[PDB]
Ligand binder design. Structure first.
Ligand SMILES: [Mg+2]
Lengths: 307, 402, 267, 307, 248
């Protein structure tokens, strides 16, 4: 396993800023830490690196200790809102970062092409955009053969093509065997590429699992909309006694809500009879799950429309 | 001690005029009669080393052309070469060569004595404390000492309480004091040159006298030292390169770093048209000696121009014409000879160094360079010093350098 | 009016600058300290040329500390592009910034020369209170004008650059040039030519430096010596009267403010 | 009719950076401009505010002149990235914009309850986060009953709870009758709240309309994420040979790119043979629609997961 | 060694600083223009050059390295660099080598043209005394600059923002060049009954600019203690900077 956090408890003074977190990241998975901007996410991201030390437990990066020099040669990182040395060049910043991590200089000009920075290389860092610097900060994270990545807000300021092309680079890496970690604050946009999310509140760790495992645990409805449905009335009432609200839409269509523990028993009941006619399933998204788990154990909702 | 008549003098002319032929003589000699004796150049009147060699007691004696050698050295009994009594009025001592360890010309109580054109080489081995005076003058009125050459005596031309007399054109080399003055009221001295001397001109307590055209070349620690001189006139003196050293005796002065002019308690005197060149101190003005007419000099090349340890203001320009200063960074818009801005030679930080010598370690600091510049920007912190409105732009002493 | 509504911001933003209040209290404790040393020595014409030299070093400094980031400090801060979408013009958010920063310099020198007057009327016994009020009234309404000149310079050098690190380099360059380089270039032109470059043009070269026009206004009555003036002793060769010297100081504002508006209009 | 851009061909340097768009806007619709980091979006965002001049074209904001003071009272704006005045307070910088736009000073407190900032009001702006400045930057835009918002990426650096609730405030102002223009770059996520999108690049307006109108205009496949499948190779040997690109996401979880006429008949294979634990059907999102229009006119996709 | 790999960065980043290149050009013109007024107008001109290099070589050192640590924390690259195979010692000592060779070159453009203006405009300068008095001058001016380099790492590591780092770097520059010697003069001219002036040659050792001028004026102490007291001010303040940098 890549990261094996076995019950750590980080504390600054008297208060415990991270209370009994216990994670386990497999070597091919893509994990996403989601929490508010307090001490929930960013202290746990530092404990994986060598920046802090667990005051009650221990971590295990790649089956070692988190500050060994053999570890950090095969570990990228990308912090949120970095600005590099503005009088240097694009290429000379990477050639400086190549000698520190021990990666060869031949890998530098590949990586400037790999993030699409070859046209704006050999120019000053001060005449770069916000999204242009994020390509450079990504390019140093792929130095060497990184067996672990920690991308903290990797897609802000980027093009929507370049956002989409970034996750194609991500999905290449998680098939090549390098587990990575996302740390984002925009949940649609990462919710297609998260293999298993690790949403946590202010203090503790709330829920970790796959997206199927979160929706099966958090009882939350689904919108199983189905057009072209024949005969419309006994098909309508057979969900009402089943415990659903069948909306008799006019254009031979029936909207079926559920609780998604009865998910699979309705899909074959919509597919096995022979008249589904181009249905649409609308699962509850990640921010709806984020709305649930924060309201489950860590606040109240805002007033009717406030924030 | 024989007499001058005990020699063999050949008379050239029968008007009490004698002529001693070439040939050596011996012992002391005494003039008791008004005999105008001359000498051939081979007349080496060499004494044995005791007594005053040529004592003169008669008036109107024209001693000429003698060559004296090795008289005594008892300075208490005044072993001179030529002793001149008060009754020996109007003596002429012309063109003589002297070599001996005592007084060269000791006169006292005389009137109109003339010591002209002589060469008095004093000594070589004595420590400049027992060599005796070159031309000693003790309370004489009317004297005329002109164009002599005294070398390696003790304290040069000593003058004590002599009222009216001229010192014209005489060369003084490698002695302790060049010219010493003691209570010589209404004196005068013109065009004298002092070289390599532990004090160029001692001017002690003598009033109303004229110091004009004199030169001081490479003297030690005191160029012209004036103590308690009143109503004097210092016009045209050239004092050059007063280097540091020590006088060796420290009797009336102390050792100095090199001062071209040291004014001590001199109240009224005109100090004009002088030239103070390349010494460590151009002029030292003590606190008791203030308010005297100092205008027209040339303070060139000195490492520190004026030393004035006071807080009283001192204008150094009479009738709107001042002195030429080498470091005067000024301009002249209205095309006169005068500069346009006044020149303060001293800062406030230039007087902290005189008051406290430990500031010399801090003298290269940038804060000191701040402290020199803050006075130039804020004149409230400028202590009232030794400034002169309208300084000169060109050298006024263009003739004294030849 | 909108010019006062944006002036009320800068009046409440410049007074929270802690770097201003350090060097505006430094202007107060030095203007008392110069006027206290002028009381123990008595003279009178040296404390005018030293107070005018103190405000030569500090009233350009407080003006350039305020307004070097007035335009470019709002442009890279993002709040300038927002402000143009408010019902304003580019001429109102500049004249409003000039009124807002101008009342700070009118108050930073009323603290400084105000406490200098109380360190004279309570220190020098038997002083003429009419002559004190008249001389320090001329110091108050002319050190603002020297401050408003360098305020209008700072709007010129902020609209031209597009990065705040380069605005601080130019504001330090303008403060070095007008205060203690132009006084030394004019000194070195007079020394090395020995006053024979131009006997009539060189007094008119004082009008191309607003710190020298500022010193020539306050040293009108109390001339005294020439060595306290130094390079400012060329003012006796100027045939211009004193009233035009006020207007030549006001023309340094209006030229360098209309230039500040013409640069900002094509931002 | 809020914004009626009618034939604006903006050219400066004779470069034609905005070539002949004809963009309307409804009285309550929420338009989304989704340009690149080039000449498309940010040129047209300046033309609505009136601070840029329309070279050969008319811009009639609110049926009036684009730079009248009467329309700038009835308009709000939020810029790209702002840090307002780091020495001022929280209330006073909002009180400063109150007298500028001419709003009443009673509104400046109720916005600080609306924007969740009353806990952090009367504090220095140099102590605020990036999120709190974006919270403040919304509060000036809602000042003085605004009838046309213009927000540029309003949710960056913000909490996911606050991101979700900000769109409720946007949905509050749509029902109040105020047109809103979002100009974002994080396009998966903003598609739940816009009513029409305006996708433009290379200067020209490429396409416009609602999200139903673009999918009708552009035949786009349906992503069928199937998690908890029987075996990986049991299906990826079959769906690939069926001519459907299908990748992997985890140990036993596949996604399937359909051709929309074979979505349902191949969903018969997924349920009737080897039933998984969860099936999610994705509609063609705003992100994948954005990829189509750039490939319609302009740039070709990158190769082997670069960029 | 990775202490050199981060030193090659700071050479390339320091030489493109426009603020440094403005002052280092201004340092070289004032070093010829003082030498112009000392030859056309040699221990008398090496003391006025010592007052010049006491103004600007602390100012050059504080312009380079006031934002060395806290400028990287605000830029975010400091948090990235600690995740590299790098100790906190090699980042600080590697910046000290990298910033150190800049002002070891800035005196070679500073005094390299000043020694050119003396050896070629006196014509009989007796250059055998020059190559040892300027060899002692260029060495001792670098070590003065390395003190204020190590002073800049102490104040950068303590603060949390780049704006308050320049507020302390200006404050350290005012205190150590022209406030410490003015309170030494104020302890002399205003206090004499409670200020022993024999103690004052030992209080000159608490100021690295003061130790800089004393090895250009050759005094109760020898020269070799002053070289070991200038090097101890580098070695203590770098050890102080390393102790602060481990507490971020
Ligand atoms: Mg003149």
């Amino acid at each position: 396993n890549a990261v094996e956090i076995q019950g750590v408890s980080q504390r600054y003074g008297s208060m415990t800023v991270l209370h009994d977190l216990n994670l386990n990241l497999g070597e091919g998975e893509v994990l996403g830490l989601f929490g508010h901007n307090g001490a929930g996410k960013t202290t746990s991201m530092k404990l994986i690196l060598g920046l802090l030390s667990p005051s009650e437990g221990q971590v295990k990066v790649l089956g070692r200790a988190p500050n060994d020099p053999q570890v950090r040669r095969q570990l990228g990182y990308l912090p949120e809102n970095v600005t590099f040395y503005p009088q240097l060049s694009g290429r000379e910043t990477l050639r400086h970062f190549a000698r520190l991590k021990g990666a060869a200089l031949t890998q530098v000009d590949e990586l400037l092409e790999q993030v699409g920075l070859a046209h704006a290389a050999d120019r000053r860092v001060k005449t770069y955009s916000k999204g242009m610097r994020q390509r450079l900060g990504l390019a140093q994270a792929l130095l060497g053969e990184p067996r672990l990545l920690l991308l903290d807000e990797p897609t802000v300021g980027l093009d929507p093509i370049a956002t989409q092309d970034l996750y194609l680079l991500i999905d290449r890496l998680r098939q090549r065997g390098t587990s990575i970690i996302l740390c984002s604050h925009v949940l649609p946009g990462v919710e297609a590429h998260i293999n298993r999310a690790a949403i946590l509140a202010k203090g503790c760790l709330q829920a970790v699992g796959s997206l199927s495992q979160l929706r099966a645990e958090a009882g939350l409805p689904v919108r199983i909309r189905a057009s072209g449905i024949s005969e419309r009335d006994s098909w309508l009432q057979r969900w009402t006694d089943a415990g659903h609200s069948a909306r008799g839409l006019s254009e031979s269509s029936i909207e079926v809500v559920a609780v998604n523990g009865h998910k699979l028993v309705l899909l074959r009941q919509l597919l096995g009879e022979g008249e589904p006619e181009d249905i649409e399933i609308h699962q509850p998204s990640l921010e709806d799950l984020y709305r649930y788990y924060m309201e489950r154990a860590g606040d109240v909702r805002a007033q009717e429309g406030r924030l | 001690a024989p007499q001058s008549i005990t020699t063999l003098p050949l008379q050239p002319d029968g008007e009490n005029r004698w002529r001693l032929p070439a040939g050596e003589y011996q012992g002391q000699f005494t003039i008791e009669q008004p005999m105008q004796l001359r000498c051939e150049p081979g007349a080496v009147i060499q004494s044995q080393g005791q007594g005053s060699s040529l004592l003169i007691s008669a008036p109107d004696v024209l001693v000429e052309g003698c060559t004296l050698y090795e008289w005594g050295s008892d300075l208490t009994a005044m072993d001179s070469a030529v002793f001149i009594l008060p009754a020996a009025e109007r003596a002429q001592i012309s063109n003589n060569r002297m070599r001996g360890p005592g007084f060269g010309v000791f006169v006292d109580g005389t009137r109109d004595v003339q010591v002209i054109g002589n060469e008095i080489d004093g000594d070589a081995g004595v420590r400049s404390q027992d060599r005796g005076n070159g031309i000693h003058l003790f309370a004489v009125s009317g004297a005329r000492v002109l164009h002599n050459h005294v070398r390696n005596a003790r304290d040069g031309i000593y003058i004590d309480t002599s009222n009216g007399n001229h010192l014209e054109g005489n060369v003084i080399e490698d002695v302790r004091y060049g010219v010493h003055y003691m209570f010589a009221n209404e004196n005068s001295l013109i065009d004298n040159v002092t070289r390599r001397t532990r004090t160029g001109y001692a001017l002690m307590q003598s009033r109303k006298l004229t110091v004009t055209g004199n030169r001081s070349e490479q003297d030690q620690n005191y160029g012209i030292l004036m103590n308690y001189i009143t109503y004097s006139t210092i016009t045209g003196n050239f004092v050059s390169d007063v280097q540091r050293g020590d006088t060796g005796g420290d009797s009336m002065i102390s050792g100095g770093e090199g001062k071209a002019l040291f004014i001590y308690n001199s109240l009224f005197n005109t100090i004009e048209n002088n030239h103070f060149e390349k010494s460590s101190l151009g002029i030292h003005l003590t606190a008791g000696s203030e308010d005297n007419r100092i205008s027209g000099n040339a303070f060139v090349g000195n490492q520190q121009q004026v030393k004035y340890v006071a807080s009283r203001t001192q204008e150094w320009s009479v009738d709107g014409r001042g002195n030429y200063w080498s470091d005067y960074l000024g301009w002249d818009r209205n095309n006169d000879g005068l500069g346009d801005i006044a020149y303060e030679p001293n800062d406030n930080v230039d007087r902290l160094l005189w008051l406290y010598p430990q500031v010399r370690l801090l003298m290269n600091s940038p804060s000191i360079e701040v402290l020199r510049w803050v006075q130039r920007a804020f004149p409230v912190i400028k202590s009232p010093g030794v400034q002169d409105s309208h300084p000169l732009m060109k050298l006024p002493t263009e003739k004294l350098l030849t | 009016n909108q010019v006062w509504n944006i002036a009320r911001k800068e009046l409440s933003d410049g007074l929270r600058n802690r770097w201003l209040l350090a060097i505006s209290l430094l202007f107060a404790v030095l203007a008392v300290g110069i006027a206290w040393l002028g009381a123990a020595a008595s003279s009178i014409p040296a404390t005018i040329a030293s107070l005018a030299s103190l405000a030569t070093f500090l009233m350009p400094l407080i003006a350039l500390l305020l307004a070097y980031d007035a335009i470019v400090g709002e442009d890279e801060g993002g709040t300038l592009m927002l402000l143009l979408t408010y019902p304003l013009g580019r001429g109102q958010i500049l004249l409003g910034k000039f009124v807002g920063h101008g009342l700070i310099l009118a108050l930073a020198v009323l603290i400084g020369f105000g406490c200098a007057a109380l360190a004279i009327a309570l220190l020098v016994e038997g002083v003429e209170l009419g002559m004190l009020f008249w001389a320090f009234g001329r110091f108050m309404i002319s050190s603002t004008l020297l401050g408003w000149v360098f305020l209008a310079f700072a709007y010129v050098l902020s609209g031209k650059v597009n990065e705040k690190s380069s605005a601080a380099g130019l504001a330090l360059g303008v403060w070095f040039l007008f205060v203690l380089v132009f006084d030394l270039v004019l000194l070195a032109l007079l020394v090395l030519s020995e006053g024979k470059f131009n006997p009539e043009l060189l007094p008119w070269l004082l009008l191309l430096n607003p710190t020298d026009i500022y010193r020539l206004i306050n040293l009108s009555g109390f001339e005294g010596s020439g060595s306290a003036m130094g390079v400012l002793s060329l003012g006796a060769d100027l045939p211009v009267p004193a009233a035009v010297l006020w207007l030549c100081l006001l023309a340094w504002i209006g030229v360098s403010l209309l230039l500040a508006y013409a640069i900002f209009r094509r931002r």
